[PDB]
Amino acid sequence: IRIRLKAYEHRILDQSADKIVETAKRTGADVSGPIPLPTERSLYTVIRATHKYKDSREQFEMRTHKRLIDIVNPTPKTVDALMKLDLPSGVNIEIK
Amino acid sequence: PRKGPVAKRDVLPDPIYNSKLVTRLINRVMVDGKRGIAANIIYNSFDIIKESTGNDPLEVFEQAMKNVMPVLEVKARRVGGSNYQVPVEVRPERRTTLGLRWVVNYARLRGEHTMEERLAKEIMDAANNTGASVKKREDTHKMADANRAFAHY
Protein backbone atom coordinates (compact mmCIF):
# COMPACT_ATOMS: atom_id res chain seq x y z
CA ILE A 1 0.00 0.00 0.00
CA ARG A 2 1.16 3.52 -0.87
CA ILE A 3 0.22 6.77 0.87
CA ARG A 4 0.99 10.24 -0.50
CA LEU A 5 0.67 13.11 1.97
CA LYS A 6 0.63 16.74 0.84
CA ALA A 7 0.42 19.97 2.84
CA TYR A 8 1.37 23.63 2.66
CA GLU A 9 3.19 23.32 6.02
CA HIS A 10 5.88 20.70 6.57
CA ARG A 11 5.36 20.83 10.35
CA ILE A 12 1.78 19.53 10.44
CA LEU A 13 2.64 17.27 7.50
CA ASP A 14 5.35 15.53 9.51
CA GLN A 15 3.02 15.19 12.50
CA SER A 16 0.48 13.36 10.34
CA ALA A 17 3.23 11.19 8.88
CA ASP A 18 4.28 10.20 12.40
CA LYS A 19 0.69 9.26 13.22
CA ILE A 20 0.37 7.14 10.07
CA VAL A 21 3.64 5.30 10.64
CA GLU A 22 2.95 4.75 14.34
CA THR A 23 -0.55 3.35 13.80
CA ALA A 24 0.63 1.03 11.02
CA LYS A 25 3.61 -0.20 13.03
CA ARG A 26 1.38 -0.73 16.07
CA THR A 27 -1.07 -2.69 13.92
CA GLY A 28 1.95 -4.82 13.03
CA ALA A 29 2.32 -3.92 9.36
CA ASP A 30 5.75 -2.99 8.04
CA VAL A 31 6.10 0.58 6.78
CA SER A 32 8.62 2.14 4.40
CA GLY A 33 9.33 5.82 4.97
CA PRO A 34 8.47 8.48 5.55
CA ILE A 35 10.04 9.38 2.20
CA PRO A 36 10.33 13.14 1.55
CA LEU A 37 9.43 14.17 -1.97
CA PRO A 38 10.64 17.27 -3.84
CA THR A 39 8.52 20.08 -2.41
CA GLU A 40 6.70 21.90 -5.19
CA ARG A 41 6.98 25.68 -5.44
CA SER A 42 4.88 28.14 -7.44
CA LEU A 43 5.82 31.81 -7.65
CA TYR A 44 3.57 34.83 -8.21
CA THR A 45 4.82 38.37 -8.80
CA VAL A 46 2.32 41.23 -8.62
CA ILE A 47 2.79 44.97 -9.02
CA ARG A 48 2.80 46.35 -5.49
CA ALA A 49 0.86 49.46 -6.50
CA THR A 50 -2.68 49.66 -7.87
CA HIS A 51 -1.86 52.02 -10.75
CA LYS A 52 1.29 52.36 -12.87
CA TYR A 53 4.52 51.99 -10.85
CA LYS A 54 5.73 48.92 -12.70
CA ASP A 55 9.17 48.68 -11.11
CA SER A 56 8.09 47.96 -7.52
CA ARG A 57 6.88 44.35 -7.34
CA GLU A 58 6.09 41.82 -4.65
CA GLN A 59 6.52 38.06 -4.86
CA PHE A 60 4.43 35.35 -3.22
CA GLU A 61 5.22 31.64 -3.16
CA MET A 62 2.98 28.64 -2.51
CA ARG A 63 4.83 25.53 -1.34
CA THR A 64 3.50 21.97 -1.31
CA HIS A 65 5.47 19.64 0.93
CA LYS A 66 4.85 15.98 0.20
CA ARG A 67 5.58 12.76 2.06
CA LEU A 68 5.35 9.16 0.90
CA ILE A 69 4.62 6.00 2.88
CA ASP A 70 4.63 2.40 1.65
CA ILE A 71 2.89 -0.14 3.89
CA VAL A 72 4.08 -3.71 3.43
CA ASN A 73 2.32 -6.95 4.42
CA PRO A 74 -0.86 -5.02 5.36
CA THR A 75 -2.97 -6.79 7.96
CA PRO A 76 -6.77 -6.64 7.61
CA LYS A 77 -6.84 -4.26 10.57
CA THR A 78 -4.39 -1.79 9.05
CA VAL A 79 -6.65 -0.82 6.15
CA ASP A 80 -9.43 0.38 8.44
CA ALA A 81 -6.88 1.70 10.94
CA LEU A 82 -5.45 4.05 8.30
CA MET A 83 -8.98 5.22 7.46
CA LYS A 84 -9.92 5.80 11.10
CA LEU A 85 -6.72 7.79 11.69
CA ASP A 86 -8.01 11.18 10.55
CA LEU A 87 -5.55 13.90 9.59
CA PRO A 88 -5.85 17.65 10.16
CA SER A 89 -7.73 19.48 7.42
CA GLY A 90 -4.46 21.07 6.29
CA VAL A 91 -3.13 17.75 4.97
CA ASN A 92 -4.27 16.13 1.73
CA ILE A 93 -3.85 12.35 1.78
CA GLU A 94 -3.88 9.81 -1.05
CA ILE A 95 -3.97 6.01 -0.77
CA LYS A 96 -2.63 3.78 -3.55
CA PRO B 1 36.42 53.54 -4.28
CA ARG B 2 36.11 55.83 -1.27
CA LYS B 3 37.06 53.31 1.42
CA GLY B 4 40.43 52.33 -0.02
CA PRO B 5 42.30 50.03 -2.39
CA VAL B 6 40.62 46.68 -2.99
CA ALA B 7 42.13 43.24 -3.44
CA LYS B 8 43.23 42.03 -6.87
CA ARG B 9 41.85 38.71 -8.08
CA ASP B 10 44.55 36.29 -9.19
CA VAL B 11 44.83 34.45 -12.51
CA LEU B 12 46.23 30.94 -12.70
CA PRO B 13 49.06 30.35 -15.20
CA ASP B 14 48.40 29.33 -18.77
CA PRO B 15 48.17 25.52 -19.13
CA ILE B 16 50.64 25.11 -21.99
CA TYR B 17 53.08 28.01 -21.50
CA ASN B 18 52.82 28.06 -17.69
CA SER B 19 52.49 31.84 -17.56
CA LYS B 20 49.97 34.14 -15.94
CA LEU B 21 50.66 36.78 -18.59
CA VAL B 22 49.33 34.48 -21.31
CA THR B 23 46.12 34.00 -19.34
CA ARG B 24 45.69 37.76 -19.02
CA LEU B 25 46.14 38.08 -22.78
CA ILE B 26 43.49 35.39 -23.28
CA ASN B 27 41.11 37.34 -21.05
CA ARG B 28 41.74 40.58 -22.94
CA VAL B 29 41.00 38.96 -26.29
CA MET B 30 37.95 37.18 -24.87
CA VAL B 31 34.52 38.52 -25.81
CA ASP B 32 31.22 37.53 -24.19
CA GLY B 33 33.02 35.03 -21.97
CA LYS B 34 33.87 32.81 -24.95
CA ARG B 35 37.16 31.77 -23.42
CA GLY B 36 37.40 28.75 -25.71
CA ILE B 37 37.68 30.93 -28.80
CA ALA B 38 39.94 33.32 -26.89
CA ALA B 39 42.45 30.66 -25.85
CA ASN B 40 42.40 29.07 -29.29
CA ILE B 41 43.21 32.41 -30.92
CA ILE B 42 46.10 33.07 -28.55
CA TYR B 43 47.65 29.66 -29.15
CA ASN B 44 47.32 30.00 -32.92
CA SER B 45 49.02 33.40 -32.72
CA PHE B 46 51.94 31.93 -30.80
CA ASP B 47 52.17 29.12 -33.34
CA ILE B 48 52.42 31.68 -36.14
CA ILE B 49 55.10 33.50 -34.15
CA LYS B 50 57.12 30.31 -33.68
CA GLU B 51 56.71 29.73 -37.42
CA SER B 52 57.63 33.16 -38.78
CA THR B 53 60.48 33.25 -36.25
CA GLY B 54 62.51 30.44 -34.78
CA ASN B 55 62.28 31.91 -31.29
CA ASP B 56 59.97 30.95 -28.46
CA PRO B 57 56.72 32.92 -28.87
CA LEU B 58 56.56 33.50 -25.12
CA GLU B 59 59.93 35.24 -25.14
CA VAL B 60 58.93 37.18 -28.25
CA PHE B 61 55.72 38.29 -26.54
CA GLU B 62 57.59 39.37 -23.41
CA GLN B 63 59.86 41.46 -25.62
CA ALA B 64 56.81 43.05 -27.23
CA MET B 65 55.43 43.81 -23.77
CA LYS B 66 58.72 45.43 -22.79
CA ASN B 67 58.58 47.62 -25.89
CA VAL B 68 54.92 48.60 -25.45
CA MET B 69 54.57 48.92 -21.68
CA PRO B 70 54.66 52.65 -20.84
CA VAL B 71 56.66 54.31 -18.07
CA LEU B 72 55.20 57.82 -17.67
CA GLU B 73 51.48 58.45 -18.12
CA VAL B 74 49.56 61.73 -17.92
CA LYS B 75 46.79 62.33 -15.38
CA ALA B 76 44.37 65.19 -15.97
CA ARG B 77 44.08 67.73 -13.15
CA ARG B 78 41.58 70.58 -12.92
CA VAL B 79 43.41 73.53 -11.32
CA GLY B 80 40.89 76.30 -10.74
CA GLY B 81 39.80 77.69 -14.08
CA SER B 82 42.46 75.68 -15.91
CA ASN B 83 42.51 71.95 -16.69
CA TYR B 84 45.74 70.44 -18.00
CA GLN B 85 47.63 67.16 -18.01
CA VAL B 86 50.32 66.11 -15.55
CA PRO B 87 52.97 63.39 -16.01
CA VAL B 88 52.66 60.38 -13.73
CA GLU B 89 54.82 57.31 -13.29
CA VAL B 90 52.97 54.08 -14.08
CA ARG B 91 52.62 51.41 -11.42
CA PRO B 92 53.59 47.94 -12.70
CA GLU B 93 50.04 46.58 -12.60
CA ARG B 94 48.79 49.38 -14.84
CA ARG B 95 51.84 48.87 -17.07
CA THR B 96 50.78 45.33 -17.94
CA THR B 97 47.16 46.44 -18.29
CA LEU B 98 48.08 49.20 -20.72
CA GLY B 99 50.41 46.91 -22.65
CA LEU B 100 47.75 44.26 -23.16
CA ARG B 101 44.99 46.76 -23.91
CA TRP B 102 47.03 48.60 -26.53
CA VAL B 103 48.32 45.43 -28.19
CA VAL B 104 44.88 43.84 -28.43
CA ASN B 105 43.14 47.00 -29.65
CA TYR B 106 45.65 47.61 -32.43
CA ALA B 107 45.63 43.92 -33.31
CA ARG B 108 41.87 44.18 -33.84
CA LEU B 109 42.46 47.26 -36.01
CA ARG B 110 45.04 45.54 -38.24
CA GLY B 111 44.16 44.61 -41.80
CA GLU B 112 44.75 40.86 -41.82
CA HIS B 113 41.67 38.70 -42.22
CA THR B 114 41.93 36.64 -39.02
CA MET B 115 42.41 37.82 -35.46
CA GLU B 116 45.16 35.33 -34.60
CA GLU B 117 47.03 36.44 -37.71
CA ARG B 118 46.60 40.09 -36.73
CA LEU B 119 47.60 39.34 -33.14
CA ALA B 120 50.76 37.48 -34.13
CA LYS B 121 51.81 40.24 -36.52
CA GLU B 122 51.28 42.93 -33.89
CA ILE B 123 53.20 40.94 -31.28
CA MET B 124 56.13 40.47 -33.65
CA ASP B 125 56.22 44.15 -34.60
CA ALA B 126 56.08 45.21 -30.96
CA ALA B 127 58.94 42.82 -30.19
CA ASN B 128 60.78 44.49 -33.08
CA ASN B 129 60.01 47.89 -31.51
CA THR B 130 57.69 48.92 -34.34
CA GLY B 131 53.98 49.11 -35.06
CA ALA B 132 50.88 50.88 -33.84
CA SER B 133 51.30 49.70 -30.25
CA VAL B 134 54.86 50.98 -30.00
CA LYS B 135 53.68 54.16 -31.71
CA LYS B 136 51.04 54.64 -29.03
CA ARG B 137 53.65 54.13 -26.33
CA GLU B 138 55.83 56.71 -28.08
CA ASP B 139 52.94 59.17 -28.12
CA THR B 140 52.25 58.57 -24.43
CA HIS B 141 55.87 59.25 -23.51
CA LYS B 142 55.87 62.26 -25.84
CA MET B 143 52.82 63.76 -24.13
CA ALA B 144 54.41 63.09 -20.75
CA ASP B 145 57.62 64.80 -21.81
CA ALA B 146 55.77 67.82 -23.20
CA ASN B 147 53.93 68.31 -19.90
CA ARG B 148 57.08 67.43 -17.95
CA ALA B 149 57.01 70.91 -16.41
CA PHE B 150 54.17 69.72 -14.13
CA ALA B 151 56.13 66.90 -12.48
CA HIS B 152 56.16 68.79 -9.18
CA TYR B 153 52.36 68.63 -8.97
Binding site: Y44, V46, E58, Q59, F60, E61 | -
Partner: protein
Amino acid sequence: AKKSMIAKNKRPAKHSTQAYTRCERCGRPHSVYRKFHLCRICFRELAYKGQIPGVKKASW
Protein backbone atom coordinates in the same frame (compact mmCIF):
# COMPACT_ATOMS: atom_id res chain seq x y z
CA ALA C 1 -20.58 50.41 -16.16
CA LYS C 2 -19.05 47.87 -13.81
CA LYS C 3 -22.25 46.17 -12.67
CA SER C 4 -23.66 45.62 -16.15
CA MET C 5 -20.25 44.40 -17.29
CA ILE C 6 -20.07 41.97 -14.37
CA ALA C 7 -23.54 40.64 -15.14
CA LYS C 8 -22.71 40.17 -18.82
CA ASN C 9 -19.45 38.40 -17.98
CA LYS C 10 -21.36 36.06 -15.66
CA ARG C 11 -23.83 35.21 -18.42
CA PRO C 12 -22.76 32.60 -20.99
CA ALA C 13 -20.85 34.11 -23.89
CA LYS C 14 -22.22 34.08 -27.43
CA HIS C 15 -18.92 32.69 -28.75
CA SER C 16 -16.30 30.82 -26.75
CA THR C 17 -13.49 33.29 -27.40
CA GLN C 18 -15.67 36.07 -26.00
CA ALA C 19 -15.55 34.43 -22.57
CA TYR C 20 -13.11 36.22 -20.29
CA THR C 21 -12.23 36.31 -16.61
CA ARG C 22 -12.98 39.09 -14.15
CA CYS C 23 -11.81 39.25 -10.55
CA GLU C 24 -14.76 37.60 -8.81
CA ARG C 25 -14.11 39.86 -5.82
CA CYS C 26 -13.90 43.30 -7.46
CA GLY C 27 -14.62 42.56 -11.12
CA ARG C 28 -11.29 43.79 -12.47
CA PRO C 29 -10.81 42.32 -15.98
CA HIS C 30 -7.03 42.58 -16.18
CA SER C 31 -4.45 40.57 -14.26
CA VAL C 32 -6.87 37.86 -13.09
CA TYR C 33 -5.08 34.78 -11.79
CA ARG C 34 -6.63 31.51 -12.95
CA LYS C 35 -5.53 29.65 -9.83
CA PHE C 36 -7.24 32.19 -7.56
CA HIS C 37 -9.83 33.97 -9.74
CA LEU C 38 -8.60 37.26 -8.27
CA CYS C 39 -6.99 40.35 -9.71
CA ARG C 40 -3.48 41.19 -8.58
CA ILE C 41 -4.84 43.88 -6.26
CA CYS C 42 -7.34 41.63 -4.49
CA PHE C 43 -4.88 38.73 -4.42
CA ARG C 44 -2.29 40.83 -2.60
CA GLU C 45 -4.89 42.21 -0.19
CA LEU C 46 -6.25 38.81 0.83
CA ALA C 47 -2.82 37.17 0.89
CA TYR C 48 -1.68 39.79 3.38
CA LYS C 49 -4.79 38.97 5.41
CA GLY C 50 -3.64 35.35 5.33
CA GLN C 51 -6.98 34.11 3.99
CA ILE C 52 -5.48 32.50 0.87
CA PRO C 53 -4.26 29.05 1.97
CA GLY C 54 -0.61 28.26 1.35
CA VAL C 55 0.32 31.66 -0.06
CA LYS C 56 2.99 33.66 1.76
CA LYS C 57 5.57 36.31 0.99
CA ALA C 58 8.31 34.88 -1.20
CA SER C 59 11.98 35.37 -0.39
CA TRP C 60 15.11 33.63 -1.64
